[model samples]
Target: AFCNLRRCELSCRSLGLLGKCIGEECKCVY
Candidate 1:
């Protein structure tokens, strides 16, 4: 669900990086 995507982005943002969610997975990047 979008909630996972949102949570992923939020966590990444807190780390001052970019975030991506795909197929129920979360990715954090520069």
Candidate 2:
């Protein structure tokens, strides 16, 4: 879960994830 969070952060910084991007914050939920 930590790794996924890191990846998500990286991706968000790059181009952002489709379903996980809400404006500027990442919407990753367990």
Candidate 3:
């Protein structure tokens, strides 16, 4: 899913989507 996030950086990460990863930094294409 990280790859998808990189491919579609515009995709918003919801609270549920980012659940445990919340507050963690992530790389995005945008």
Candidate 4:
């Protein structure tokens, strides 16, 4: 599957953090 920045961002935001896309993956940054 591919990574979606929008979804990732919202997801991270839900966790009160930051999100980024890297090589088809979504990562959260605190």
Candidate 5:
């Protein structure tokens, strides 16, 4: 699922490839 979830990070635009929970912020990752 690529960017299929709204709360998901933008990095998932690569198609279920990445993201992470860093501290209190949930952000995108490669």
Candidate 6:
């Protein structure tokens, strides 16, 4: 469901979630 070469932040506000970088962690906000 993403476009533009897979480099973008998805706005999850629709699911009551916000985008947080979480300091380079790429595992389910781990």
Best of the two (3, 6) by TM-score = 6
* Model 3 C-alpha lDDT per residue in residues 1-30, reported as the tens digit of each score: 344434233443432233222234444321
Regions of candidate 3 where Cα sits further than 4 Å from its true position: 1-3, 10-30
Q: Which ranges in model 1 have alpha carbons more than 4 Å from their true place?
A: 1-3
Q: Which stretches in model 5 have alpha-carbon errors above 4 Å?
A: 1-16
lDDT of all predictions: 0.83, 0.50, 0.35, 0.92, 0.56, 0.35
Candidate RMSDs in Å, in order, are 2.0, 8.4, 8.7, 1.3, 7.0, 7.0
lDDT of 1 by residue, 1-30 (tens): 454877788899999997897666899999
Candidate 1 displacement at residue 4 in angstroms: 1.0
Output the worst ten-in-a-row residue range by lDDT, candidate 5.
1-10
Preferred candidate (lDDT higher): 2 or 3: 2
Q: How accurate is candidate 5 locally (lDDT)?
A: 0.56
Clashing residue pairs, candidate 4? none
Candidate 2: tens digits of C-alpha lDDT, residues 1-30: 134555566665555443254555555543
TM per prediction: 0.60, 0.34, 0.18, 0.73, 0.33, 0.24
Candidate 6 error regions (>4 Å): 1-10, 20-30
Model 2 per-residue lDDT at 14:
59
Instruction: Give me candidate 4's TM-score against the actual structure.
Output: 0.73
| Candidate number that wins on lDDT, 4 or 5 | 4
Output the worst ten-in-a-row residue range by lDDT, candidate 4: 1-10
Prediction 6 TM-score vs. true = 0.24
Greater TM-score among 1 and 6 belongs to: 1
Clashing pairs in 6: none
What's the residue-level lDDT of 5 in candidate 5?
42
